[PDB]
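Researcher: Re-running this chain for the archive, since the previous output was lost when a drive failed. Same request as before.
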Amino acid sequence: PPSAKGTVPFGQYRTWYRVTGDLHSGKPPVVLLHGGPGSTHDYLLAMTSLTEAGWPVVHYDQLGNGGSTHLPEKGEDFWTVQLFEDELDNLLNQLGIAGDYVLFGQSWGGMLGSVHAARRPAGLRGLVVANAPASMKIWLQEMARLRALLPPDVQETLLKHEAARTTDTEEYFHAMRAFYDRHVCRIVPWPRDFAATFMEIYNDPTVYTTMNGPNEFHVIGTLRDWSVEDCLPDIQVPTMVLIGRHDEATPATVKPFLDLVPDVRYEVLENSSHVPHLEEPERFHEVMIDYLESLV
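Model: Regenerated structure tokens:
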């Protein structure tokens, strides 16, 4: 239930946002970076709970999907990490919060958040990288590991359709679901917020399919080889790594955060996978509030 919403100009285009709570009360805003790339803020809407403890919360849709400008006819060389860094900087400026803010980055958003934090901006108080790998290379190795633990028939079904690029078929989708049900979202039927974002991706898949791939594990888009490991030593703020025990973002994928970020803490939500804010709503809230209070 938002205290403000709309768009801000981002050069030629628009970026859509929403604030819950009061921006300039006693506590700095928590700015939420959604995953994908090419996902939407919707699946993160549970995190309005943080306003219960006085934290303003800023949800926004990154350029290319949701309430922001859609650019279906922009291709691979337009959809860059620099673009989204520039958008986040622009957004903090337009909302007048560049002077004081905390970043929570989920999935891709945690990778974007790390790149942003590595430039050592003055107003940043803390960084959370939630369900976010440090490297898509390590991600793809770990996907192969997790996929090898699926039933043999599921493994063959995934392979067949990936090879021939028929991943839009019904049969691939239900094999993909055997993976998602373990490591992406263990709640089925899906939470509305999760479904909401999932359908935003279906309706304009430009960004997600360009940068990531057809789904969470089949990463064949332009971020396939991408790693943020080289900027991690430069992050000065206290950082929290938060994953689910069953997360596709496995302990191996987040290990570089633990070894390279100077000030870093580690939390595993034992009954969660990729969306602990939905899977363990209360425990996620408690963990976040505990971390956030150390910053004020």
